[PDB]
Design a protein around this ligand. Structure first.
Ligand SMILES: [Ca+2]
Lengths: 258, 238, 268, 35, 258, 238, 131, 35
C-alpha cells in the first residue's frame, strides 16, 4: 500500500491490507527478552589456581613481568582480553611465536541477538570441571573490587588469602559442580552493549567501559601451596541472564556474503 | 524427623535451559534505578518489525570496491520480459542476511505469519512509471514472465507523489509453522518467490538522470511470530 | 432403502442395491473449516466442481488371486487421468493452487449376477504409496494397463519395497527388511470400507473427511486417501455366464479449500 | 517471568533471590513516533 | 446373529445376544492410548563425541567423504538411517564388506501397536551410559534445526561450540544419568506413522516425511578436543511418550506363518 | 533452614515405567492445533472391536504362490461327519495372528470377555444351505462329530438374504482373566475350540459355480478387555 | 482522492493520479442476477477468478496518427492470450461452459511526463468486430 | 492422565511441563457410521 518510508515510520501490515485474507494467530512469545536470555551459555574456560596468584597487570604490560595468566574470568558478554575489559575482540590465527597468548572471551550468542544499546540483569553462574574427578572451589569479587593476594602460614603450610574473605567462595564436592546467582553489582545503571564514551579525562580509550561487568571469578584447589601439582587443570564458566531487560534498538553483527 | 525422599535418575544433572532459579550467593543488593532510561524493549519482534535494507549483488558490473552488494535495484531502460529482481521466500537466503528480520529470525527454528517487503523509489520527482510486484507460492519452475507473475499474488505500484509501497507476502503454508533455515529444501522451508517486474517503462523528461533506483526493505508483518530459540552462528567473529 | 440417487451439481448417480453410505470417523465427514495455516482467502466450492467424476478400473477375472489389488490415489488419479478420470474444472483449479484441502465421497460400481460368486474389499486407505513403484517413480497409465492387478507379495506385506533414498557409495548397502507403508491384507477392513459381494450388491459407497499431518497440503504431492479395491474371494461362475465383469468408480471432492493461487503447475 | 516454570514456591525472599532498585522518593508499543 | 458385513459396520455382541448369559464386568483400561505409550523404551545406541563433529551429509553420500557416523540420534519411532529420516528399515545380515555400516533405528514396540495413521505427544528422554564410570553430557537441537559445528580456542585448547548455545545441554555427574522431557516441536501438527506424500516438488521420495521427529540428540565428553581418547564410548537413548494421542485406525505389521 | 531428609535405598534408580513426570528442558512451547483432525482414537479396544480377517492354510492343495494362507473356507461338496474347519480359542494361535484382536491382544498378558467370530457367505445368491457353528470348552479330546458339537454351545446358520452371521464365543473360565499367550498349555491359556460343520449340504441350481466360500473375521466382543502391557515381539522386522 | 488502490482476491492495483472510476449506465454495474434463460444452477464468482488480470498493448509512438487504434475483445483476449493476457482459472472455467454472463472493470495504464503531450481516448465499446 | 499416579503436586506450570495448542480464535464412540 501507499507509503513514504522517508518518514522514519512504516506500519506493519497483513494479508488483508492490500489483498484478501486474515491475520495469522500468534504462535509464541519466544522473542520475549526476559525469556530469551534466560538460559546458560559458555563464557570462558579458565585455569585452576594452585597457589596465591598475582593478578595480571594493566596494559601495556612489558616483557619480564611475573604474573598469572588465564586464571581470572571477567563476567561480561562484552569482549575481554587477559581478564580485563576490551573493545576489539581477538584470537590467534598463528599460535606460533613469542609472547603470552592473551585469553579472550565473548558471549557469541548474546551479541548475535543484542540488537540494543543497553542491557541489565542478574547473573546465574555455573562452573563445570573439564578434568576428571576434580575437587575445586570458586572465588568471586564484585565489579570495582579486586583479588586479595598473598597468603598466611598455618603449620608451615602456605594458605592463600583467597581461601577467606567476605565475598562468595563455593567449594564443590569431588567431581561436583558449582552454581549460584549474583545480582547486578556494577556502579553503572546498565551495561553498555556498545559504548561511545571514555572512563577517564586523560589518555583514555574511547568506547572502553570501566565497569561493564558482574565482577570476576576464579577457581582454585582446596589444598595448600606446598601440595601443588604440575598438570594444569581447567574449568568451564557458564552464565545465564536472569530478569533481563534491554533498551534502545541497535544493530546485529554484519554477516559476510563471501 | 527426616522426610523420606527418593532422588530421581537425573540427580546432580546440570541443564542449561532448566526453567528454574538457583541459590543466591550475595543478596540484599539494591541497584541504581533505571526509570530515567527510555527506549526499553520487551520483545525482539519490536525490532523485527522495523524495516531494514535488503542486499543484492550489483548486476554483473561491480565497483572497484570488493564485496559489491547494494540495497537497491537500478531500473534498466531496455525492455525484457523477466523480473528486474527476484528472490525466494526462504528466510535464510542471503538477501535477508543483514536485515533485522532475517538476522533475528535466523536465531529461531520457526516462523509463522507475514513478511513485509517495502519499496522506495529514489529516482527524480519528474519520473513516472509503474511496477508489478508479485509473490508466487512454490511451483516446479520459478515464474519469469509478466503473464505468469500476473497470475499469482500481485499488486501494481504507481510512481508519483508518495515514494513508497509496502507489499505483504501472505503466509501460505501447509503447516502452521515454517522452517526459518532451509537446511534441506522442502515445502516447509522454501515458500516460493517474490519478484519485481517493470510494468510500463519509466518515463523521464529531457535532462534527467537515467536508471532510477529502488530501495528494498524487509520486516516482519504484524502477525509475524518466531518460535524455538536455536544456537547462534558465531562466524561473524571470524 | 436400497434404491438411492445422489445428486451433486449437474451430476447424479443411482443404485438399486445400496448398502447405505459408510461415513468415516464422523457422522458428517462433509463439515470442514478453512486451513489455519494460510492467511489468504481460500477458493471454496463452486458449482462446477461440486459433482461426481467417473472413471474406470481394470476388469475382474477368474485369474485374479486373493489379495490382489488396484489402487486409486486421490487427488493423484485426477492429475494423471488414471482410468480416464478427467477432473474438468476441479483439476484446472488444483493445478493452479499450491495448497488443497478436501474430503471425498466415492462409489465403486461392479455388477455381477445371482449366479456369480466372489467378493471385493473396497476401502479408503490413509497415507499410502501403493501407486508408486519401488524405484520411486509413479506407475504410468501403460504400466497399470500391463499388470491389470497388483499381486499381494512378501514385499507389499512387508513394506520392504516402498520408495526410499539410496544411501550412496559411502555406505554399505543394507538389507531392507521392512517399511512402515506395509499392507497387512487381513486387516484392510480396519479402514472405512464396504465389501462388494457378488450376492448382495452391485456397488458400495464411502464418505471420508479431510485428514493430513498438517491443516492443508500440497496439491501436487499429497495422497492422504487412496481408493483400494482388493479381492477377498476369487471370482467364479459356470460356462455361459458373462465373463470379466467391469469395474468403475465415481469420486466427488467435498468441502474443498484451495490456497496459494498461481500460474499453472509446471514440472521442474 | 522469563524462562521459569516454577509457579509454586519461592524459598528465598525477593530481595535475596533478586536485586531490586532502591527508591529515589501482547501490547507492543512503537519505539518511534511521528509528530 | 443375522448381519451383513458388506455394510462396513458390525456391532460387538455378547453372550446374551444369541445365547443365555450376561456381560463380563470390565477388568482394566490398559488399552487406553495415553496410558499405554507412557513408558520408556530403547530407541538407539550412539557413540559419544570427543571433539566437534561433522554432521553426516545428505544422501547419496559418495566415498571419500569425511564425517562422523553413529553419533547423532533422530528422535522418532519411525525408521531412521545414518541419523536421518528413512522409509525402509534395514540392518546388516552380512557385516562383512566395504563401506560404512549405517546406523538404523526403529521403535519396535511402537510399531507393533501403532494401528493408526497419526500420532502426537511430548517426549521424555533418558540417556544411560553403556560404559563404566562415564562422565558425559547430552546435546539437543529442535526438529528443523541443525548441529552447530566447529570450535573456539581457550588457553590453546579447542572447545567445540556444542558446549554452548540456546538449546538444552545436560551434563550428567560421573556415572550418573540424564533425563528430561521435550515438547512436540515439529512444524507439522502430528507425526505420520505411515505417510503417502512428498516433501518437495522435485526429485522427492514418496512416503518420506521431512520433520516427523522431536529433534536430534547427541552425547559428548565435557573435555577439550586435546584430551581426546582412543576407545569409543557408547550411550543408550530411551524415549517415553507423554500425553499421547492417536488418529485414524490403521494396520499392525504382518506376522509371518513360516 | 535445611529440611532433614532420608533418601531411600533406591535413590538414583531409573525405572522405565515410573508413574510420574521428569523435568522440562525446553518449555513454553505452543503447538499447532489438532482440532481439524478427525478419527481420534482413545483406546485400542476401539480397534480390536473392528472385525478383521482370519487365516487358514489352504486345504493340502496350495497355489504356486508361496505362503498360501487364505481368509476363507471353501465348502466341499462331499459329505463328511467332521468339522469343515476348527481352531482353538487360544489367542496366540496362528489363525488370529494377523487379525487386529489377536495382534493387539498379543501385546498384553491377559484378556477377559468375549471374542466374536463373524462369517460371511460369498457363494452365489441362488445358493441355499445351513451350517452349525459350535464352541466347546476344554475337554480331554477335541469334538469332531456333529452329535458332539451339537451338545456344546452352538447356533445353526441359514443361508439366505442376509449374508453374515456373528457368533460370540462366551467367556467361560475358572479365572476372572485368561492368558493371552499359551506359553504353557493349561486351562487358563487354552479355552477349547470353535468349529464349523455343514449341517445340510449346499444346494445349487444348474450352471452355478461349486464350492462357495465363507469369509472368517475375528474381533473383540463388547465386554472384551485386555490387561497388563507386555514386551512386543520384534520379529516382524526380520 | 487521486491516490487509490483497488483490491480483488489476491490482487491490488494502485494509481496516484486517479480521475475516479467511470461507471457505465448504473451507479453499481456490479449488481447482476442469474440468467433467466438457463435452468441449471450456475457457477458464480469464486475467489480464484475474482481478481485483476494484466496484459500489454503496443507502445505509443510519435508516428501513430490521429484516430489510429488498438482493440481488446472481451472475453476474446482471454481466449487468445492477446498481450499475454492469460486468464488463469477464469479462462479454464470459460472453456468449460457453453454460456457466460459478466461485467468488466478495466484500467488502462500509460505514464508519460509533464514534458510530453498527447491524448488517448480509452473506451469500452459495445458489440464490435474490430478484432 | 496416562501412566501417572501423582495426584498431589505439580511443581512446574502446565505450559512448561507440557506443550499446549495455541488458539485460532467408558464411552467409546464408533469410528464409522452407516448412513
Ligand atoms: Ca535429597
Amino acid at each position: 500500500s501507499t507509503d513514504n518510508a522517508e518518514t522514519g515510520v512504516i506500519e506493519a501490515g497483513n494479508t488483508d491490507t492490500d489483498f484478501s485474507g486474515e491475520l495469522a494467530a500468534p504462535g509464541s512469545n519466544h522473542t520475549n527478552v526476559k525469556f530469551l536470555f534466560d538460559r546458560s551459555r559458555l563464557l570462558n574456560v579458565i585455569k585452576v589456581l594452585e597457589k596465591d596468584a598475582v593478578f595480571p597487570r594493566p596494559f601495556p604490560t612489558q616483557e619480564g613481568a611475573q604474573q598469572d595468566d588465564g586464571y581470572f574470568c571477567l563476567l561480561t558478554p562484552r569482549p575481554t582480553v587477559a581478564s580485563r575489559p576490551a573493545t576489539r575482540f581477538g584470537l590467534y590465527a598463528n599460535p606460533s611465536g613469542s609472547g603470552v597468548l592473551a585469553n579472550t572471551s565473548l558471549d557469541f550468542n548474546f551479541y548475535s541477538l543484542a540488537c540494543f544499546t543497553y542491557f541489565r540483569s542478574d547473573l546465574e553462574v555455573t562452573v563445570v570441571s573439564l578434568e576428571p574427578d576434580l575437587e575445586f572451589a570458586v572465588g568471586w569479587f564484585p565489579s570495582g573490587s579486586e583479588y586479595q593476594a598473598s597468603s598466611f602460614v598455618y603449620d608451615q603450610l602456605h594458605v592463600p588469602f583467597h581461601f577467606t574473605g567476605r565475598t562468595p567462595r563455593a567449594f564443590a564436592s569431588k567431581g561436583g559442580k558449582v552454581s549460584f546467582v549474583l545480582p547486578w553489582n556494577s556502579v553503572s545503571s546498565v551495561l553498555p552493549v556498545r559504548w561511545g564514551g571514555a572512563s577517564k579525562l586523560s589518555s583514555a580509550t574511547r568506547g572502553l567501559p570501566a565497569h561493564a561487568d558482574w565482577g570476576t571469578i576464579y577457581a582454585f584447589v582446596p589444598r595448600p601451596n606446598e601440595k601443588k601439582s604440575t598438570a594444569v587443570k581447567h574449568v568451564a564458566v557458564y552464565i545465564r541472564y536472569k530478569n533481563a531487560r534491554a533498551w534502545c534498538p541497535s544493530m546485529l553483527p554484519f554477516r559476510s556474503y563471501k | 524427623g527426616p522426610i523420606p525422599t527418593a532422588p530421581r535418575e537425573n540427580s546432580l544433572m546440570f541443564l542449561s535451559t532448566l526453567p528454574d532459579d538457583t541459590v543466591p550467593a550475595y543478596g540484599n543488593v539494591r541497584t541504581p534505578p533505571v526509570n530515567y532510561l527510555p527506549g526499553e524493549i520487551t520483545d525482539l519482534l519490536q525490532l523485527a518489525r522495523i524495516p531494514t535494507l535488503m542486499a543484492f549483488e550489483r548486476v554483473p558490473e561491480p565497483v572497484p570496491a570488493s564485496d559489491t552488494y547494494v540495497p537497491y535495484v537500478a531500473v534498466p531502460t531496455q525492455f525484457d520480459d523477466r523480473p528486474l529482481i527476484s528472490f525466494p521466500i526462504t528466510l535464510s537466503d542471503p538477501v535477508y542476511q543483514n536485515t533485522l528480520v532475517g538476522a533475528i529470525s535466523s536465531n529461531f527454528a520457526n516462523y509463522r505469519g507475514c513478511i513485509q517487503i517495502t519499496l522506495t523509489f529514489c529516482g527524480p520527482m519528474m519520473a513516472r512509471g509503474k511496477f508489478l510486484l508479485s509473490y508466487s507460492p512454490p511451483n516446479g519452475t520459478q515464474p519469469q514472465t509478466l503473464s505468469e507473475a500476473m497470475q499469482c499474488t500481485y499488486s501494481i505500484w504507481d510512481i508519483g507523489l508518495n515514494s513508497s509501497w509496502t507489499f505483504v507476502v501472505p503466509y501460505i503454508s501447509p503447516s502452521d509453522y515454517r522452517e526459518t533455515r532451509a537446511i534441506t529444501n522442502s515445502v516447509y522451508s522454501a515458500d516460493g518467490w517474490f519478484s519485481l517486474h517493470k510494468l510500463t517503462k519509466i518515463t523521464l523528461p529531457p535532462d534527467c538522470p537515467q536508471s532510477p533506483c529502488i530501495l528494498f526493505f524487509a520486516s516482519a508483518g504484524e502477525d509475524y511470530t518466531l518460535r524455538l530459540p536455536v544456537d547462534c552462528n558465531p562466524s561473524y567473529v571470524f | 432403502d436400497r434404491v438411492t440417487t445422489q445428486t451433486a451439481g449437474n451430476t447424479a448417480i443411482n443404485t438399486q442395491s445400496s448398502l447405505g453410505v459408510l461415513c468415516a470417523y464422523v457422522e458428517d465427514p462433509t463439515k470442514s473449516d478453512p486451513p489455519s495455516s494460510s492467511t489468504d482467502q481460500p477458493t471454496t466450492t463452486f458449482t462446477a466442481i461440486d459433482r461426481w467424476y467417473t472413471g474406470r478400473l481394470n476388469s475382474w477375472t477368474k485369474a485374479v488371486k486373493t489379495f490382489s489389488f488396484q489402487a486409486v490415489p486421490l487427488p493423484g488419479a485426477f492429475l494423471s487421468r488414471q482410468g480416464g478420470l478427467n477432473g474438468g474444472a476441479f483439476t484446472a483449479t488444483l493445478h493452479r493452487h499450491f495448497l488443497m484441502k478436501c474430503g471425498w465421497q466415492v462409489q465403486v460400481q461392479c455388477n455381477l449376477t445371482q449366479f456369480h460368486q466372489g467378493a471385493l474389499l473396497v476401502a479408503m486407505v490413509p497415507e499410502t504409496t501403493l501407486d508408486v513403484k519401488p524405484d520411486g517413480k509413479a506407475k504410468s497409465l501403460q504400466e497399470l494397463n500391463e499388470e491389470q492387478w497388483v499381486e499381494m507379495s512378501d514385499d507389499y506385506r512387508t513394506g520392504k519395497n516402498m520408495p526410499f533414498q539410496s544411501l550412496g557409495t559411502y555406505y554399505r548397502p543394507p538389507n531392507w527388511t521392512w517399511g512402515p507403508n506395509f499392507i497387512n491384507p487381513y486387516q484392510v477392513t480396519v479402514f472405512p470400507h464396504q465389501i462388494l459381494n457378488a450376492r448382495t450388491s452391485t456397488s458400495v459407497d464411502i464418505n471420508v473427511p479431510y485428514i493430513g499431518e498438517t491443516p492443508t497440503q500440497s496439491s501436487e504431492t499429497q495422497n492422504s486417501w487412496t481408493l483400494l479395491v482388493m479381492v477377498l474371494v476369487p471370482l467364479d461362475y459356470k460356462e455361459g455366464a458373462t465373463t470379466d465383469p467391469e469395474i468403475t468408480f465415481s469420486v466427488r471432492p467435498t468441502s474443498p479449500y484451495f490456497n496459494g493461487l498461481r500460474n499453472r503447475y509446471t514440472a521442474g | 517471568r522469563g524462562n521459569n516454570g516454577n509457579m509454586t514456591f519461592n524459598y528465598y525472599a525477593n530481595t535475596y533471590q533478586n536485586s531490586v532498585d532502591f527508591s529515589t522518593s501482547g501490547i507492543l508499543n512503537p519505539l518511534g513516533y511521528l509528530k
